[PDB]
Design a protein around this ligand. Structure first.
Ligand SMILES: Nc1ncnc2c1ncn2[C@@H]1O[C@H](COP(=O)(O)OP(=O)(O)OP(=O)(O)O)[C@@H](O)[C@H]1O
Ligand SMILES: Nc1ncnc2c1ncn2[C@@H]1O[C@H](COP(=O)(O)OP(=O)(O)O)[C@@H](O)[C@H]1O
Ligand SMILES: [Mg+2]
Ligand SMILES: [Mg+2]
Lengths: 471, 520, 48, 471
């Protein structure tokens, strides 16, 4: 479809292009406006308003465009490069590398942004745990293969730190790739800091950055770009999924994807729905998070970060996000103030895979009893702070001691990210977490003071440090 | 030869054979409808989006009122009038200037109050300049930036110790009604007297009297030697208020990329304050609704998160490859009854790196900077602090968090045990320490010394209502009896192990000498 | 007795705060929905 | 008569009139519709729709109009008389005298309604305190010369009575004139109860009415009249400002101005903003307020009443005016029902001019200490509600007594309040009120009971009453 049209209307980041009566571009067909030299503006067709007129979102500056400019139809949605050539590179919404390196090249396979999800036959009937290395994540709210996990928290609780240490864990300890979709990524927070963090984490002769793809829909971009960056990262990850690999896509803020969709719908003149949101919120979430599944060939596990507006979990954006979630990891500022870097609240982190018949019979006894002990501590904390531990009877003093031990034991140094409290790499497996927490839950740790459990290992590091200090 | 011969040699080239006397069919537009600051033009097909149009002078009007061609609809150009809408009439000629909006930039704008178009309004003569920078440009990008390391010293102990602001960091100041947001911004501007940083103040949608008072405050403290005051007041059209912060940040990006000679030193660091982004968003909402663009939540247009983001993502910290300069943004947001979850507040909060929350409850309770430490964050953190402040303010942050956990027991402290009463008294003394008078910023050495005195057990003897006075007196002591202690603290403020025995012993001796010779 | 009664009162006050926060979230969502619906009705009745 | 057109549409108070294409009226022009009674209907143009058609706000009944009526363009905006001829007269939005006196002659100067505000370089930053006759206004929230000051309260708290009392006080005890803008003025508050109350003799034969100008944009007027009555009063006051005189402007209500703007915008078919309000709310408020400034030549100093429904200060009407204020006087119904008829709350009544560098150190010290003791009493009254004052007090008895005495001493009998009470009015200079509060603050009033502070002038009046009782 080499059809050439002309720009008819320009209203903000929403343009209209008049084409011939035949060969009109389809919906999501990525028209392109040359701007001189090699620069071009890639718009995405959203509506067909009659005789050859298509309404599209700019996905670019569109601040120097005149009416009547030539527009080239591409005949397909936005084409982004896929393959090993995308590893170690940073892309915008259009798949153009926004790092210092040059273009990808014409010999690299390009794929459309808008694909269909895996069919009904391709879905995996039986779920499977995804080991991630983190103690609290693998124990309390375990991941699922081809599933969605959402991390919550405040502005500075450490969600991005958790995301990047998970990227490092996936890249270094196992030979697996990951794709990071920085939707609404600040040009300071992610466009240099995350690159430095990924290029600082090194295993041998290569970095964690070398085993991950990055697609940055920065905040300065128009709402269409921040809307389509998630699908761009999905397209770049589905290649490795088609090779049978287990990709773990990360999403910087799925709420900013929702807000980009709402802004795009408002700019197109559509009637608002719910709390001023787009009418197509459910379908827009489905077209993204139904491509994150466990195919019979390969799998895409995903980890989103969700911003909850006004701490309202019944808000339509968290309501629609929660419909697709398989696990939740709640970060609390209170835990962060106690110098706990993995500030995961085990009493607020859930997972659908936490079942006796999937993650193990001992898993859904150790996790259940750990949660019960922590709930007992949460109940008794006010009494302890007001009165003191002397009022607590037996079976409650021991419970509080074990609860403090596990609460301080959930902390990890994230030695892969920088070298803060650096120590030999552990990457504690799921079975090791189960065995350590069953060990402490069955006593065997009461002689340890409640200060050794800090950035520790697998409860064998705890006893090793106890023997080293004084034994 | 004479220099006038060189002057004539410059002439007699364009004078004789340098002018093209060719008449050409230039495409102009005719006005078909004038609204409430929006004029629609029939045919102007040689116009780009956001291009400044002229409206050339006509009978009874000896000046041209420019506009901004925003809606390039099919056979229609809706342009928002920058000046006054009364003079524009149906059938008026409109000539496309062929240019996007640009503002004069450079050394000449230093101490000048200017329009968003760059025209001076201070009445101090024309702006001297040789370069114009475009209003709208893309942010520096991905590889251009650098991690924020250099601190911006606002002079407020609470901000500089708990909510660090670094060069290249977008730190929102969000408050409500009269809580001192402009006071905090002006205090930050006044503290850059010799810090090698050029300040810019935008003042979108304010009073002419308020901007005049701000300029008078700046020029009575000598701050206009390095400050640029853009001004789009309340009476001015919504187009000027819409383009004011972009003009300010264009000047700031000129400072960042090239730099200016300030005090004989090249300065490439700029601190910009958008004193009302809520008013800027209101002005752009008026522009969009008068253009009949489809509204969204709270009647704001769809591209209102985009609006501010273009403005705020231009504040960067460039690496040494791209000059090493920086632009620091201090947006100001006014909430309504502390409605943090409103549209524009959430937009700016998500965009900006950190937030500074000002509460009316603290303002009316005597807290002179009405800063809410509990909810306000700076995600850059310790990287935007000196090593001295990093070493000292950690215990201050911990003690203040402990006090905020126990704030309900403050009036009951006489009936509690020893440790809880001690924590409450320490928190009360620290909160009284953070109270600062207006227009009195403190240097980093003074803040470090005061916070070291407070962090260690030295303010326990002096009662709470005198803590502030103690601080003032101590500073006077350090300003008169021991300048060497202040110089020593300032000299090794970048040392990784800041409390070296030399500076530690000097500071302890100064504190003991002050306490022994003073009574409270 | 005062300690126990005030602990119970604090727990009941926290429960009431939770219920009132749910009610406030419902009210805020309804208010924003009403506002955007009114704005859309007033805009679509004069443009298209 | 530059142009004559015909009426095309009459929709309520909106007139669409078709003019010749080369003689279309300007944006803020006034167009007269001659009626069959010797009078005319003056509409204000607001828009230019297409080819020669203009939309105008009626500023009249439009119950006698038919399509095709002749419409004469005036070429310029609404022209209102200025000068001494307007002094002592009552006008409307069109500048026509609505009192029983004769029409204004054609020899007077007539100025357009819409004028640009003074430029930035004409602003006089020198803050000067304007002496009001009110004790609490002088002490707590001093009146700024050339600045804009507001009064906030519910219904019946005393805003209009306070405004007319300042008119009487500053016209009697001072030579300052006054211009009154009855925006949305009730026909009981404006047609009576202010004309009669301005029949207060100044010296021998001149009343306050003879030295004041009144422009009543009454409530039964269409929204355009109530929208432009404030600008009419501003135009009338700007003549006295341009003569070098320090002129006083009282806008009797601000939220009615906002309501008129909202109604005008809704009637014109503009897109609604915020909660159904006008999109040009901030611009209209700025256009009104920015003309009230202190210049080198003269100074318009204004007091504007604002009615907050319930306690909602976040409504668009008080929120859009907060940016334009130099001082706020918060009237409370609780204080009014306690027979303190000047029901100013000393707390929550701020002022930018309350600075020791402007009003002096003694004024600042006295005001700050009075606010401090009142703040202490705000808790001590609760404390003594159950535990009697005689039971226990560590200087609490003395500070409670002083605070009760000063909160009664803030009450002042007004000249215009003789109808309500019968007590003759009192005027206190700004020096005498701060001196009296300084004297009462530290002793010298502890023996006089809290009955001689009720309705008095300075402290000398309280003393004279005390030793008049003890005869
Ligand atoms: N640290 C302080 N100590 C004492 N007074 C202060 C302080 N900061 C501000 N003020 C006082 O409070 C007033 C209001 O502060 P300011 O004007 O900065 O607030 P704002 O949030 O910008 O308000 P506005 O909405 O009026 O623009 C100042 O004019 C000053 O008199
Ligand atoms: N100084 C005063 N003395 C006595 N009564 C007063 C005084 N001020 C107000 N009032 C009471 O308030 C009423 C007038 O209130 P008004 O000022 O018209 O209300 P608003 O403040 O809403 O305009 C009168 O009926 C009177 O009883
Ligand atoms: Mg301000
Ligand atoms: Mg009234």
């Amino acid at each position: 479809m080499p059809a050439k049209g002309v720009i008819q209307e320009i209203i903000g980041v929403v343009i209209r292009a008049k084409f011939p009566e035949d060969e009109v571009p389809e919906i999501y067909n990525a028209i392109e406006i040359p701007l001189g030299n090699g620069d071009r503006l890639v718009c995405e067709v959203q509506q067909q308003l009659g005789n050859g007129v298509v309404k599209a979102v700019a996905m670019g500056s569109t601040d120097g465009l005149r009416r009547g400019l030539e527009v080239i139809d591409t005949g397909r949605p936005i084409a982004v490069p896929v393959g090993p050539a995308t590893l170690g590179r940073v892309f915008n919404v259009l798949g153009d590398p926004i790092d210092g390196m040059g273009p990808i090249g014409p010999e690299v396979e390009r794929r459309p942004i808008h694909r269909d999800p895996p069919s009904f036959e391709e879905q995996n009937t039986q779920a499977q745990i995804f080991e991630t290395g983190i103690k609290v994540i693998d124990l309390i709210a375990p991941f699922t293969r081809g599933g969605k996990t959402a991390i919550f928290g405040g502005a500075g609780v450490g969600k991005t730190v958790v995301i990047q240490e998970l990227i490092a864990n996936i890249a270094k300890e196992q030979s697996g790739f990951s794709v990071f979709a920085g939707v609404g990524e600040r040009s300071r927070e992610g466009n240099d800091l995350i690159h430095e963090m990924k290029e600082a984490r090194i295993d041998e002769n290569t970095t964690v950055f070398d085993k991950t793809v990055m697609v940055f829909g920065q905040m300065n971009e128009p709402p269409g770009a921040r809307l389509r960056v998630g699908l761009t990262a999905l397209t770049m990850a589905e290649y490795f999924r088609d090779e049978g690999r287990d990709i773990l896509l990360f999403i910087d803020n799925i709420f900013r994807f929702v807000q980009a969709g709402s802004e795009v719908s408002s700019l197109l003149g559509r009637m608002p729905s719910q709390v001023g949101y787009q009418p197509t919120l459910g379908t827009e979430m489905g077209e993204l998070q139904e491509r994150i599944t466990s195919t019979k060939r390969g799998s895409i596990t995903s980890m989103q970060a969700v911003y909850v507006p006004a701490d309202d979990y019944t808000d339509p954006a968290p309501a629609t996000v929660f419909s697709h979630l398989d696990a939740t990891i709640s970060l609390e500022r209170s835990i962060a103030e106690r110098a706990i870097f993995p500030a995961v609240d085990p009493l607020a982190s859930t997972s659908r895979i936490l079942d006796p018949n999937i993650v193990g019979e001992e898993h859904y006894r150790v996790a259940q009893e750990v949660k019960r002990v922590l709930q007992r501590y949460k109940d008794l904390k006010d009494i302890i702070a007001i009165l003191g531990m002397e009022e607590l009877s037996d079976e409650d003093k021991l419970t509080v001691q074990r609860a403090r031990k596990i609460e301080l034991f959930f902390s990890q140094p994230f030695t892969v990210a920088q070298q803060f409290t650096g120590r030999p790499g552990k990457y504690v497996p799921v079975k090791k977490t189960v065995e350590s927490f069953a060990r402490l839950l069955n006593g065997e740790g009461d002689h340890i003071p409640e200060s050794f459990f800090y950035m520790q290992g697998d409860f064998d590091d705890v006893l090793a440090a106890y023997e080293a200090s004084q034994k | 030869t004479t220099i006038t011969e060189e002057l004539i040699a410059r002439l007699k080239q364009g004078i004789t054979s340098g002018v093209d006397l060719q008449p050409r069919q230039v495409n102009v537009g005719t006005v078909i409808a004038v609204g409430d600051g929006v004029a629609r033009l029939s045919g102007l097909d040689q116009v780009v989006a956001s291009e400044i149009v002229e409206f050339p002078p006509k009978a009874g009007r000896n000046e041209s009122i420019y506009g901004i061609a925003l809606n390039l609809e099919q056979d229609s150009v809706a342009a928002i009038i920058l000046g006054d809408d009364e003079t524009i009439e149906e059938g008026d000629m409109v000539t496309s200037t062929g240019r996007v909006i640009s503002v004069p930039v450079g050394q000449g704008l230093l101490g000048r109050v200017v329009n968003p178009l760059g025209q001076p309004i201070d009445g101090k003569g024309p702006i001297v300049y040789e370069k114009t920078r475009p209003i709208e440009r893309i942010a520096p990008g991905v590889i251009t930036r650098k991690s924020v390391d250099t601190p911006v010293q606002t002079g407020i102990i609470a901000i500089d110790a708990l909510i660090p602001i670094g060069r290249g960091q977008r730190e929102l100041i969000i408050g409500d009604r009269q809580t001192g947001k402009t006071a905090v911004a002006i205090d930050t501007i006044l503290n850059q007297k010799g810090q090698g940083m050029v300040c810019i103040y935008v003042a979108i949608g304010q009073r002419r009297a308020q901007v005049a008072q701000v300029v008078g405050t700046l020029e009575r403290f000598g701050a206009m030697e390095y400050t640029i005051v853009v001004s789009a007041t309340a009476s001015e059209s919504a187009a000027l208020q819409y383009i004011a912060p972009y003009a300010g940040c264009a000047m700031g990006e000129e400072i960042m990329e090239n730099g200016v000679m300030l005090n004989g030193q090249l300065v490439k660091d700029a601190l910009i304050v958008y004193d009302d982004l809520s008013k800027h968003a209101v002005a752009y909402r008026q522009v969009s609704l008068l253009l009949r663009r489809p509204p969204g939540r709270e009647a704001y247009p769809g591209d209102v998160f985009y609006l501010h983001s273009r403005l705020l993502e231009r504040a960067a910290r460039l690496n040494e490859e791209y000059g090493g300069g920086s632009l620091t943004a201090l947006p100001v947001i006014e909430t309504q009854a502390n409605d943090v979850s409103a549209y524009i507040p959430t937009n700016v909060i998500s965009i900006t790196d950190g937030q500074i929350y000002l509460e009316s409850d603290l303002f009316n309770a005597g807290q002179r900077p009405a800063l809410n430490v509990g909810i306000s964050v700076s995600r850059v953190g310790g990287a935007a602090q000196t090593r001295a402040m990093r070493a000292v303010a950690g215990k201050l942050k911990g003690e203040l968090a402990q006090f905020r956990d126990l704030a309900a027991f403050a009036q009951f402290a006489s009936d509690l045990d020893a440790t809880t009463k001690a924590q409450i008294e320490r928190g009360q003394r620290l909160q009284e320490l953070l109270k600062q008078p207006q227009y009195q910023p403190l240097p980093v050495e003074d803040q470090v010394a005061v916070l070291y005195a407070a962090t260690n057990n030295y303010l326990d003897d002096v009662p709470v209502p005198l803590i502030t006075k103690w601080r003032d007196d101590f500073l006077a002591f350090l300003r008169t009896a021991h300048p060497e202690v202040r110089k020593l603290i300032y000299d090794n403020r970048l040392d990784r192990k800041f409390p070296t025995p030399e500076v530690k012993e000097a500071l302890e001796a100064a504190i003991k000498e002050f306490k022994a010779t003073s009574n409270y | 007795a005062r300690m126990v009664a005030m602990r119970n009162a604090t727990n009941n006050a926290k429960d009431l705060v939770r219920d009132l926060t749910l009610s406030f979230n419902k009210a805020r969502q309804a208010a924003i929905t009403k506002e955007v619906s009114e704005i859309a009705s007033g805009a679509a009745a004069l443009t298209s």
